[PDB]
Amino acid sequence: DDSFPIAGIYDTTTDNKCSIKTAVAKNMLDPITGQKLLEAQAATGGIVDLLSRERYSVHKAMERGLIENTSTQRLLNAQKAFTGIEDPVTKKRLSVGEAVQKGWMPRESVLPHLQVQHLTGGLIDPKRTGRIPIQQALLSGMISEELAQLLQDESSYEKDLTDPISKERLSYKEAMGRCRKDPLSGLLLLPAA
């Protein structure tokens, strides 16, 4: 819905929603999984505020207490997948898929973010609404053949998240599947105790 990422956590013990930040702090969600969920938010348009559905840049999120100080640095990297970057030579704005091809960023750093973009409707073209399908991205040279193939093969995505309920290792796609929608906000919440 609305091409949003996983937004927050569903506290199964109290039947209440809570933020990723609160869940990590209360030991309801493992810290690494929490950080990756926040990266996915940065990479798709901003950190989600559960109370309003608004989304915020990393800096604005920290100032509003939506994230911890210790997350800010790594979240800025993920945020580039949304904003794109400026080419140091040509000064043009590049998507991160183009940055990889131009040698400015390593493929390994960028793939997870393109994966989350794909799973929420398609690749992001910086400064534009409307997601780009993988095949269109490939034909335009926005991504390489290898990145396209990796993005297409959803069943093979890395299982680097831990389901707080089952303790199973899940991919981002599987994690999305475990989510409920919040009755108030409509946003995706991952259950945790």
Author numbering: 1822 to 2014
Pull text from the paper.
The plakin protein envoplakin is upregulated during keratinocyte terminal differentiation, and interacts with the closely related protein periplakin to initiate cornified envelope formation. Although their architectures have diverged, all plakin proteins except periplakin contain at least one plakin repeat domain (PRD), which constitutes a conserved node that links cell junctions directly to cytoskeletal frameworks, disruption of which has dire physiological consequences. Of all the plakin proteins, envoplakin is the only member to contain a single PRD module, which is connected to a central coiled coil region through a linker domain. The structure reveals a basic groove that can accommodate acidic patches on the cylindrical surface of monomeric or multimeric intermediate filament proteins.
